[PDB]
């Protein structure tokens, strides 16, 4: 399916690349500090592992649905053949960038001074259980080539890992950047739905729908706590 309105298509591209930038720029400050220090002391090792799980899972869904004519046909067979694919180029760019950045972090953890830091049993357990389940789903889908079903599991895994990021977490510049990308990724989906006259993209990409809303709600909650509720 193609865009109807020229201004709505341009709006959707501008809000998408704003979402890409506000969420990709935050990877560099820690990475630069770690290389200069030649150490990872101060970094949460559990969070690095949980984020590699989340970013690889979202990346699988975005790259596959964006580039595979085969998986795109499965999408059309499920939500409608007049539907627009709900994965934008900025989603693909965000995902690949977030995996490379997280992989650089892991390489830094491996080469650099670690101090008394170590991934917790509870975090290793979450990751092992999540990866095991994903491997169970890869083998169930492999004979029937159920690739839309498989990457929708990968997308639900990122929604689980997104809940793990915010729920325990419950200064302003980083919150504002995170909130901007959540609102920009949500608004992107709205603009698409308005133009196509269809809300199916919210169901076909329930991972992006929840990733954006979990981010918005939780960042609003943190801003409400640091300024209204207590100080």
């Amino acid at each position: 399916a193609s865009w109807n309105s020229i201004p709505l298509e341009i709006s959707y591209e501008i809000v998408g690349w704003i979402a890409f930038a506000s969420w990709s720029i935050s990877f560099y400050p820690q990475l630069i500090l770690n290389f200069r220090r030649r150490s990872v002391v101060g970094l949460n090792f559990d969070f690095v592992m949980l984020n590699l799980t989340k970013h690889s899972s979202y990346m699988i869904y975005n790259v596959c649905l964006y580039f595979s004519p085969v998986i795109q046909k499965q999408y059309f067979d499920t939500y409608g053949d007049k539907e627009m694919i709900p994965v934008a180029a900025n989603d693909v760019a965000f995902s690949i960038h977030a995996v490379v950045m997280t992989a650089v972090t892991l390489f830094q953890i491996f080469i650099y001074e670690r101090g008394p830091q170590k991934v917790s049993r509870l975090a290793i357990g979450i990751v092992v259980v999540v990866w095991g389940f994903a491997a169970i789903c890869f083998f169930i889908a492999l004979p029937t080539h159920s690739w839309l079903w498989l990457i929708s599991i990968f997308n639900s895994i990122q929604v689980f890992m997104t809940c793990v990021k915010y729920i325990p977490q419950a200064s302003i510049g980083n919150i504002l950047l995170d909130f901007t990308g959540g609102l920009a990724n949500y608004l992107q989906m709205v603009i698409q739905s308005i133009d196509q006259n269809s809300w199916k993209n919210f169901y076909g990409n329930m991972g992006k729908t929840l990733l954006s809303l979990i981010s918005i709600f939780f960042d609003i909650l943190f801003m409400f706590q640091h300024y209204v509720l207590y100080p």
Partner: nanobody
Amino acid sequence: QVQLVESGGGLVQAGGSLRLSCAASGRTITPISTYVMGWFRQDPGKEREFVASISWNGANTYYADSVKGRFTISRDNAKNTVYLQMNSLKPEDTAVYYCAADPESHVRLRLGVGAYWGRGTQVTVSS
């Protein structure tokens, strides 16, 4: 791969009418009725220039400032056909008119970087 076949080109007197048609067909992952369709034109040593475009919903039409008000674009999604009704023709309108299509972007089709192009139909305007 989508084939775009133009029709309707010919000689016409200044101030007259000519109606171009373009039939779209080919093996596609998305239905051709969901494609952006349009028209471009070209004069000998010049770059191809935008003429008109129509969204797959049929609600958003775009025109070049020079043809605005005289040329009307319409489409028939049951036939996969796009039309250009050219009224009030001027000698300057003499050019090859190319049909154009894009499976996803109205920006790319308007910008002239659309995926599919027809072979062209010569339109000649006498005096």
